[PDB]
Amino acid sequence: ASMERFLSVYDEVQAFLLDQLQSKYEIDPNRARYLRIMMDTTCLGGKYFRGMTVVNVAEGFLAVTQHDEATKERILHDACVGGWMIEFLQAHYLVEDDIMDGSVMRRGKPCWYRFPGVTTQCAINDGIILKSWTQIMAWHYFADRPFLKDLLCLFQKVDYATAVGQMYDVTSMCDSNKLDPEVAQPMTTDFAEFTPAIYKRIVKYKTTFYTYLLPLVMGLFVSEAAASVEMNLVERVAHLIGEYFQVQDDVMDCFTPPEQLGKVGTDIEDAKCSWLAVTFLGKANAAQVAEFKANYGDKDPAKVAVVKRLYSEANLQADFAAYEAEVVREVESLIEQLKVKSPTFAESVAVVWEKTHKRKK
Amino acid sequence: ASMERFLSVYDEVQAFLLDQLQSKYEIDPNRARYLRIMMDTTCLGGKYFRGMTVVNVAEGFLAVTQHDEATKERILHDACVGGWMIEFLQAHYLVEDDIMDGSVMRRGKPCWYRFPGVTTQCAINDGIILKSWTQIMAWHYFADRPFLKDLLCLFQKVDYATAVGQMYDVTSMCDSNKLDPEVAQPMTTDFAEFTPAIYKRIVKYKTTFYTYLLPLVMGLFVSEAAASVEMNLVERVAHLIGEYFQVQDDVMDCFTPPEQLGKVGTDIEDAKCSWLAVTFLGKANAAQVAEFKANYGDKDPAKVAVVKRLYSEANLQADFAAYEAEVVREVESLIEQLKVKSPTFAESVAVVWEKTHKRKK
Numbered sequence A, B: 001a002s003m004e005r006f007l008s009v010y011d012e013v014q015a016f017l018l019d020q021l022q023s024k025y026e027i028d029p030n031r032a033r034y035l036r037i038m039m040d041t042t043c044l045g046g047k048y049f050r051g052m053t054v055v056n057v058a059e060g061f062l063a064v065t066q067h068d069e070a071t072k073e074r075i076l077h078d079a080c081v082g083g084w085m086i087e088f089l090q091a092h093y094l095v096e097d098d099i100m101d102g103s104v105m106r107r108g109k110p111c112w113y114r115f116p117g118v119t120t121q122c123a124i125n126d127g128i129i130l131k132s133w134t135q136i137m138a139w140h141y142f143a144d145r146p147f148l149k150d151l152l153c154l155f156q157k158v159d160y161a162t163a164v165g166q167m168y169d170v171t172s173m174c175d176s177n178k179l180d181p182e183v184a185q186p187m188t189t190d191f192a193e194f195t196p197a198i199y200k201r202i203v204k205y206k207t208t209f210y211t212y213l214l215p216l217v218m219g220l221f222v223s224e225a226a227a228s229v230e231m232n233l234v235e236r237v238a239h240l241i242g243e244y245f246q247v248q249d250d251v252m253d254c255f256t257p258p259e260q261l262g263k264v265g266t267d268i269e270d271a272k273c274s275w276l277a278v279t280f281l282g283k284a285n286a287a288q289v290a291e292f293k294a295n296y297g298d299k300d301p302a303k304v305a306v307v308k309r310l311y312s313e314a315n316l317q318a319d320f321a322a323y324e325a326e327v328v329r330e331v332e333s334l335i336e337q338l339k340v341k342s343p344t345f346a347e348s349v350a351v352v353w354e355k356t357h358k359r360k361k
């Protein structure tokens, strides 16, 4: 009902983008083609959680708010375009993240850079184009909209936030006091920065702003219902669900086979400050902690297997359920406080929470 | 007088950026430090032609326009910030370009990714941050300015244009009909796409929009004098100077020693559709053309030396002066047509033209 409306607007956006390249950017048909496959491979294939949040939030408000048929048509269209803005922004992140994480598979297919006729050299620019598309979309479809200014200001701050998060994420396996562009960076030995506080910082910026804050508040913008809600609660609900979503993603990088995921894990091999590792060091004994340090951050399969072993043995799925329960408490609690000013946005969050809580992919 | 005012505003912008990271983005001092060196290494060291165009254009108008001392202070400050917007945007391009071109040296120092304690993995994100800074700067300093909307719309279209240009540039050594993400790309053999038309297309988008259009029109924005000029002429003067600037850059990649440049050329090794190569094929005989094809697009030093040889022999500096003369004609001509509506912007262009025409670095 909304999903089919969503995916129809992509074709409309893609055509307006690719035609503009012909009529303004002197593009030859083969490059226009290349960019079509690029767009397809990088924007489609995923869960569309971020996009469909914008649309579900908008639909929410359209059931209680009196509008003419045309305005209802307009709000539903803006919401899909905004959804695609966020989806193109994630396309951009994944392309760039994959190169940064040396990944092999993504959404069941090879990573964009790993495509034989792409390579790292082109993918980098492809990523930049994906970003650039978000803005052309915005200015084109939203030029004459009351919400343009807010939308763009939020957007570019969500984006900055994400990139700051990546910085924390790719340097999470270095000792802070050793960071220096002049000197090649040695991987941590004491793992003293694998603390819940430092991990929560990584996840906040690299995930929660663009995966939760942005779509929720976006769907409010297209509805012009930003005043109708309590931001401090929206900020808090988004950061809490997002941290969970990332904790989820972390557990799956270890335990969920790529056949279902469908990407191949790299968190152990890459020395990532993952949820699994932090929790482990938060409970392990001296000897367990010792074996970890001699086997983590290495691409050697048996050393990765030694780490996967230690995680099963250290019974981490138990610390997961104590965290999951603690989250549902806090999530349900935060939804209650929202039922006051904005009942329609509370159930919107509830739906996004259910989607998130029961995801496996 | 303006240069010293320019460089003072960088320190002010850098502090506002780095403090915001402390007070909003939970940054630790060592990462704040890292980003300071990153900012410094990537934004400073260059000619500041793009930034100083914004300021020279603004100063131009401030000599003829009646303003209070405070408004003069304000316009000069906006112009420096805008200048840094474009300078941070180029920082972003160079970081990403260097990885894409496999470069070794930049502004007399190693390329950002080549720094021992950086690597390709971090530089990619550093590039994204550099971009993201342009927008935070904008929204912070220009929130309450009449010109914000135009500035941002122009900016994101200049940026898209540049990235489309890069696409044309990194795939300029492939046959169009062979482009395919599924199949690894073979380098051209017939060089049929090395035609002035195809080259002019590459340069238009990858250089002229961000190096000339953007600063010129930007300096008009901060002055609010966009109506006071003829855009079709501004567009045309910018594309013509920019193509020249790029032709300049191309010649220097071959002939200007890195000791002065100061970067190391990669155009021959990388099979770049450079000005030199196109002009060569535009004049060479059958046998000369034949030797080129067996020696171009190769990192082998002697094969590069065989190509540098053919360029001297084919007397390309002669085709340069016929082009340079043809440009000064057209540039001086276009300046005349501007003297009508906007005399102050004409001399601004004249100054930028002199700066460009007599650059060696």
Ligand SMILES: CCCCCCNCC(P(=O)(O)O)P(=O)(O)O
Residues within 6 Å of the ligand: A092, A093, A094, A096, A097, A101, A162, A163, A166, A169, A206, A249
């Ligand atoms: C360039 C900004 C990228 C933001 C990071 C995206 N987070 C997703 C990544 P992760 O951060 O490596 O978990 P993946 O999908 O698990 O590979």
Ligand SMILES: CCCCCCNCC(P(=O)(O)O)P(=O)(O)O
Residues within 6 Å of the ligand: B092, B093, B094, B096, B097, B101, B162, B163, B166, B169, B206, B249
């Ligand atoms: C990512 C967009 C980059 C725009 C290209 C910048 N042009 C400068 C490059 P070029 O395009 O390789 O000549 P360089 O300074 O000569 O290495």
Ligand SMILES: C=C(C)CCOP(=O)(O)OP(=O)(O)O
Residues within 6 Å of the ligand: A045, A046, A047, A048, A049, A090, A107, A207, A211, A245, A246, A249, A361
């Ligand atoms: C940011 C993260 C952790 C990516 C994981 O799956 P996503 O839901 O984000 O990616 P899609 O497959 O839905 O694009």
Ligand SMILES: C=C(C)CCOP(=O)(O)OP(=O)(O)O
Residues within 6 Å of the ligand: B045, B046, B047, B048, B049, B090, B107, B207, B211, B245, B246, B249, B361
């Ligand atoms: C875009 C090109 C051709 C870069 C060459 O020198 P620039 O003038 O652009 O670079 P700076 O050293 O001034 O930053």
Ligand SMILES: [Mg+2]
Residues within 6 Å of the ligand: A097, A101, A169
């Ligand atoms: Mg990652």
Ligand SMILES: [Mg+2]
Residues within 6 Å of the ligand: A097, A098, A101, A103
């Ligand atoms: Mg990853």
Ligand SMILES: [Mg+2]
Residues within 6 Å of the ligand: A249, A250, A253, A267
């Ligand atoms: Mg992950």
Ligand SMILES: [Mg+2]
Residues within 6 Å of the ligand: B097, B101, B169
């Ligand atoms: Mg290049």
Ligand SMILES: [Mg+2]
Residues within 6 Å of the ligand: B097, B098, B101, B103
């Ligand atoms: Mg280059």
Ligand SMILES: [Mg+2]
Residues within 6 Å of the ligand: B249, B250, B253, B267
């Ligand atoms: Mg060059």
Ligand code: NA
Residues within 6 Å of the ligand: A139, A140
């Ligand atoms: Na338009």
Ligand code: NA
Residues within 6 Å of the ligand: B139, B140
């Ligand atoms: Na601010």
